[PDB]
Amino acid sequence: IGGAVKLSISYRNGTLFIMVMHIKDLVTEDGADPNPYVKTYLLPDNHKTSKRKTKISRKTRNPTFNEMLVYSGYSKETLRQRELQLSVLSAESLRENFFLGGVTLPLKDFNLSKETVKWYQLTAA
């Protein structure tokens, strides 16, 4: 577990925008290059509908995604009662997908009237 993810987070027209830009310095226990993708949830997830994820970036510890994850139909009031749970996992075809690191971000901490671009350190459980 290690590394850091750069995100751009904003809100416009009743929609939350999470831009996954890139990740640096992912590590694996056995030293082989992972196949990272990013998955996010908005928690708590009453209806169990909030999974979003990026494409897989293959064979790299420093993936660039520049992908936008979109959450529609939420008011800021509701969002301030949610946390964004971000996971980085390796896509594996011959073994279980495994956890490379994550970060949980209470959305109340953001100024959702502007765009916030920032680096976040990835951690364990």
Side-chain angles (χ1 to χ4, degrees):
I1 301 300
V5 58
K6 188 185 183 178
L7 304 173
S8 166
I9 290 176
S10 60
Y11 179 95
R12 88 183 152 139
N13 304 324
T15 300
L16 174 67
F17 295 93
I18 312 285
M19 175 83 107
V20 182
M21 297 172 82
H22 51 288
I23 301 182
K24 68 181 191 159
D25 303 328
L26 294 165
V27 297
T28 62
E29 58 189 32
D30 64 348
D33 275 344
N35 304 297
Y37 63 102
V38 177
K39 172 168 61 173
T40 61
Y41 284 88
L42 281 182
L43 302 187
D45 192 347
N46 177 228
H47 296 293
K48 302 181 187 181
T49 52
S50 75
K51 186 170 79 180
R52 305 288 184 273
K53 59 186 195 175
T54 65
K55 292 179 63 181
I56 298 154
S57 183
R58 296 190 172 276
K59 296 310 213 313
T60 182
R61 275 142 52 251
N62 298 276
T64 289
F65 295 103
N66 293 323
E67 278 186 69
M68 180 75 90
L69 302 182
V70 172
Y71 286 105
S72 317
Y74 296 85
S75 70
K76 303 171 182 204
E77 290 169 348
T78 298
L79 288 181
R80 288 195 300 279
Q81 299 186 327
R82 300 289 183 273
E83 72 196 0
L84 181 76
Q85 182 198 80
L86 185 151
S87 295
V88 186
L89 284 96
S90 184
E92 299 291 330
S93 73
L94 300 183
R95 61 188 277 192
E96 290 295 292
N97 287 5
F98 61 95
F99 188 73
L100 297 162
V103 60
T104 299
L105 307 168
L107 290 177
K108 65 173 186 284
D109 295 334
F110 291 83
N111 173 358
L112 289 186
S113 302
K114 69 184 257 281
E115 174 188 9
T116 300
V117 179
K118 158 176 199 173
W119 284 92
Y120 304 88
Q121 170 183 315
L122 299 170
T123 68

